[PDB]
Subunit: 155 residues, 6 copies
């Protein structure tokens, strides 16, 4: 009965996030995507959850839930003690390293990092929103569903 | 039926390696420690395997095997497609990132990185050997068994 | 024929920026310094002040011109018939964040980015740190062109 | 008579800070801990509370004293007859913004900066992360001096 | 007439190298690929084989030519009337040893270095890792030009 | 009372090293430059040559002395009644490798390590790169003390 939690804001979910979800779902029996409620973003929590659910329909062992507060409490309250996070740079590793060590210290929760697929090395929710705001084409970087929803928030 | 391979030379295995093994064994159903045969080291392959087996007796779902050649072939020939590796720095992440992306490309094998326990952040097989060679006390950094064997190779 | 764009907010321009401008001007037929203006947040200097400070310290570069813009950098570049950006870099961390933006710029518009290592003497000046040091009275006269230093002190007083 | 200044906001002081203070006091005749007063961002503890938490935690360091200050750090250092800063570091990224600042401080005032690696056990603690964890009920008592932990529980009630 | 030199051992040339060559040839009037001859470490391919592999892969770049050389790179560059080097980069660490070399080359000979980010798809390929993977039977054909892959299979037999 | 050890192979000493020596000598009562000799691999310069080059360029530092040693640095430090190492750092990568050794040194012997950022003008000189550039004829006269440069050229000829 293995399992891991994939946390983030996912505003919106990108193909880089989806790649991490698919890799986590292939290596753990149960994956929970943890969508942070952090009350300034573009999509509401419900919209973010729906976009992730739409993009993960081919992953039978993955579910999507929202939460607040300490990630380690979210993880432990579901009987798990592993986090799976995607990583792009060594700079990414250092700040995430501090949080991983803190999370292990306070709750015994482990963090596994997975390297980003090369094709999504430069994709982030924030950069995709910013580029699309000025009319740049990000359709190759986002799930097809997410892309239409993004066009709608801008127009 | 989840599983991961933890590769290295382990010459000798340190408490930093053991920490990674224990974390992998807690999150995957099956863990295989892959001891590289790379024919200049201090211990023979058989001695390295025995030291790891001695230090992992409390991990029922972990076994230790030797191998050569492409790590991805070792992994795939055992029905698995995940590697678990310990990481200390962002510099660690960058060279290991290149190998992880190559391994995914050529064999579909994924790599999960886990941050080192803070207490073992500075321990490496090479630095422990070098310090012990000049008489420094590394007993707090190595499994109790390994420590005696190391004293024997030097004296 | 060849050309590159050197972008930044240049609020104000530093000697590190000027070094980059001079290196780009020596290697490309034309260089455009693109002064980024945020229509929502004013900097310390207005657009005309930023441009004046750059022009005064680049008068010896005949193939360099200065223009302002906003929004997507790759549109500024392509509308001028060019497809190269030149940017200065001080460290490995600068390289990772700038890396993301360079790969996005090539993906969305085919525009290439060339990075050049700062001259050592200017490794540590940034517009933001020069402003913060000067705000609390530190001497930054050797890090800014003559066209900048006293205008900066006047803004602060 | 040698000496160094250890600057920070210390809101609150952590065991990582204390480890740096102890190592500085062991190697310099005089150490001054400089507590930054920022008239903008007012943190969780007042400057007086922060000074008292540091004094309790450093009671066994006779050559270390605690003072508050404002503005340019190198002015604080030189006003006390010193020309050295001692700061703790955790990562290579830490070394990057801090290296820019150290070179700037050497350039503008001739003040030197010595960096020391955090003890491994305290490498993941920071004032900000400790407060955030404690706000949501996590146990950070192994990462803070005993008296800080008591005061921090009070501020959260 | 602008120009730049693209140096390396290219043993063998990869698609990451080729991407850099194409971007340099698009932005400079003349590009010289400089193939290093090292009388000590003799790699897998002779210098002539390496030049021919590059020429096959760059047949559509008319302003790019391939030459071999030895010793100090900045002497090779200045002997050809140029003063710019173009190199591809992958990581922040890459930027570190390469930044030291670029500053040294600027200091000793006035030669500038422009760095370009690898295309994402080729960011994990290197000559050395490709050879190692191919030696043990891994498939690196998507990472090398077609003619390189054929020659590399031959050397392994 | 206070003191620090500045270790290295100094084969040969550079102006970056001398900058570190001067900064340590201004902040500690005594400084010992510890010249590391590998009894198994000779460097370019013998131990007496390395020491002579350092002494000639540190004659204005009355509280600095030069001694050779081998093996564990922490034994050299402790046998002299000291427990501080001072080392220069150029980049974030330098900080990670040196980090490992500083934490091991504190673990096995209680010896602290203080790092100081190189002066910008010497950010890019290393003994190894100066030797390699000089080997192929490049001009490194401005990166080495007078006590070194012509002795280096003589070794190479
Ligand atoms: O990044 C975090 O701190 C975080 C993300 C998150 C998601 C949840 F669903 C609950 C708590 C969280 N904390
Ligand atoms: O690091 C490697 O390349 C490697 C380690 C290893 C261990 C094995 F058992 C087999 C192949 C390997 N390759
Ligand atoms: O950094 C940018 O995104 C940017 C800089 C810039 C300068 C211009 F003139 C126009 C658009 C820009 N965008
Ligand atoms: O980091 C700073 O800018 C800073 C810290 C500090 C502390 C003092 F007590 C006085 C000035 C300061 N400046
Ligand atoms: O990297 C170098 O040192 C180097 C590469 C190279 C290529 C040439 F053709 C000539 C000299 C070189 N030096
Ligand atoms: O870098 C070292 O390990 C080292 C430097 C050194 C210098 C001495 F004089 C003695 C031992 C040393 N060890
Ligand atoms: Mg993102
Ligand atoms: Mg190791
Ligand atoms: Mg700037
Ligand atoms: Mg802190
Ligand atoms: Mg290569
Ligand atoms: Mg050196």
């Amino acid at each position: 009965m293995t399992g891991a939690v994939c946390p983030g804001s996912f505003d919106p979910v990108t193909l880089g996030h989806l790649d991490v979800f698919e890799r986590a779902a292939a290596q753990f029996d149960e994956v929970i995507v943890a969508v942070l409620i952090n009350p300034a973003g573009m999509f509401t929590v419900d919209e973010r959850i729906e976009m992730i659910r739409e993009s993960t329909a081919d992953l039978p062992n993955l579910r999507v839930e929202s939460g607040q507060g300490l990630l380690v409490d979210f993880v432990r309250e579901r009987g798990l003690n592993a986090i799976v996070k995607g990583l792009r740079t060594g700079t990414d590793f250092e700040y995430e390293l501090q949080m991983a060590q803190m999370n292990k210290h306070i709750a015994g929760v482990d963090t596994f990092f997975v390297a980003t697929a090369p094709a999504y090395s430069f994709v982030s929710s924030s950069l995709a929103k910013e580029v699309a705001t000025y009319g740049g084409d990000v359709s190759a970087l986002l799930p097809a569903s997410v892309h239409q929803r993004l066009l709608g928030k801008l127009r």
